[PDB]
């Protein structure tokens, strides 16, 4: 989530090969602590896994089939 924008944003935060780097990059390491605990935000699994969750989807794609059929029996 925050990590997703955080990749593209930590991207060009780097400033040349000069010691201009670490003067900001130590605080960036603090940001790395912060994101290290952002990993804790995603510490547990919800629905199983792709594609096993996708298998659940296709399972619904079979489960949708009766739904499109029994109405034909309305009369």
């Amino acid at each position: 989530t925050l990590l997703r924008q955080g990749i593209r944003q930590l991207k060009e935060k780097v400033s040349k090969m000069e010691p201009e780097e670490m003067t900001v990059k130590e605080k960036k390491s603090i940001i790395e602590i912060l994101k290290a605990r952002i990993a804790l935000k995603k510490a547990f699994l919800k629905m199983a896994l792709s594609e096993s969750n996708d298998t659940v989807v296709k399972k619904e794609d079979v489960r949708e089939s009766p739904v499109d059929t029994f109405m034909e029996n309305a009369t």
Partner: protein
Amino acid sequence: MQIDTLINQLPGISTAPKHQLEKIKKLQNSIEEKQLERKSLESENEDLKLQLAKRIETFGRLSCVLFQP
């Protein structure tokens, strides 16, 4: 006094068994007609509804079809 109070409402106040039995005759003129008529409805119903219930069983077949897509 209570005795008199139950004297007050002797059943069949008309006190005419000769004609109260006639009342029963008219009552049978109703009931004896109604007898098989009311019960005829039973068979008149089942003649349709038993097979209609098996129709419920046929849509029971289709319900079973719905059970297992």
